[PDB]
């Protein structure tokens, strides 16, 4: 079971984030057990997102993403740029040897962390600037999502789509991805 | 401000019901005051969408039904075709004219007055969809309508 934690910052792209979980949850739909996620927060039960709706989540537990493949940081266009703690947790989580990952403009975050250096990446347009001004060694891909050895990232919705589909694809083959996508689109 | 209310059901359709609120909160970035709304629940301040995401409502209340001008009704695949009080509360508030609407099968709930069988669709002031992407017309239909064709056309170019 591939473990996949996403951690909702405020007015987080909900978009992205539904679309993201569609694609985990239907890859289940026809292969059992496929993937095991959670809706984090770093602080609260609850997170805003850009839509004025509220989805309950676990409160991070520094602990708790020990048995994590995958954390994802998921922002959004109005995502308070903050949440300094993200800088070792990231690191951390780079160093236990996670795979992290980042939706809407959640890459600004790893890029900031230190875990995007040498790694391309995708992200919103708003925040390419001060990503590439705070992390030089990070290459800004000229599309939606990026695929690149451990780092997974999307700049919109649809890339998110693209972005999980690229995570089934390189899991359990072209077969699930191929059949997840006919479900969806 | 038009005035929108969603019943979340257990297992409702989570992209459904996301796109819908879409259109709407777009509309608003385009033209503020242009719409309200607020997601509802039966039961709980807390139901559980078909992605086994759970998302904050309120509780249904008929005193606040009030200011409504449409009302709609989320449903999902594995959502159960029970909830009693949806006669009394429907016929009631189409007792008031009131707009209504269903998403994906929530029309069958719809049935009980007037595969799931019983992509959008808008007859009068009596709204449906059976698809997430029928929801996305279904709302912009409604944009279109009250608002016109020019904000109507620009939120589509937005979402998409
Ligand atoms: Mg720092």
């Given at each position: 079971p591939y473990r996949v934690d996403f951690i909702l910052l405020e007015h987080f792209s909900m978009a992205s984030f539904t679309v993201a979980m569609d694609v985990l949850v239907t890859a289940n739909l026809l292969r059992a057990d496929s993937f095991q996620f959670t809706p984090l927060s770093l602080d609260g039960d609850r997170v805003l997102s850009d839509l004025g709706l509220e989805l309950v989540a676990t409160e991070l537990s520094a602990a708790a993403l020990?048995?994590?493949d995958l954390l994802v940081v998921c922002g959004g266009?109005?995502?308070?740029?903050?949440?300094?703690?993200?800088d070792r947790l990231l690191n951390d989580c780079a160093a236990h040897g996670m795979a992290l990952g980042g939706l809407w403009n959640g890459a600004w975050f790893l890029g900031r962390a230190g875990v995007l250096d040498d790694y391309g990446c995708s992200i919103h347009p708003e925040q390419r600037a001060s990503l590439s001004e705070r992390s030089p060694q990070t290459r800004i891909t000229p599309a939606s999502f990026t695929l690149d050895r451990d780092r997974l990232s999307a700049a919109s919705p649809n890339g998110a789509m693209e972005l999980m589909l690229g995570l089934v694809r390189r899991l359990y083959g072209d077969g699930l991805a191929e059949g997840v996508e006919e479900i969806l689109s």
């Open positions: 020990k048995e994590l266009l109005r995502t308070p740029l903050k949440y300094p703690e993200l």
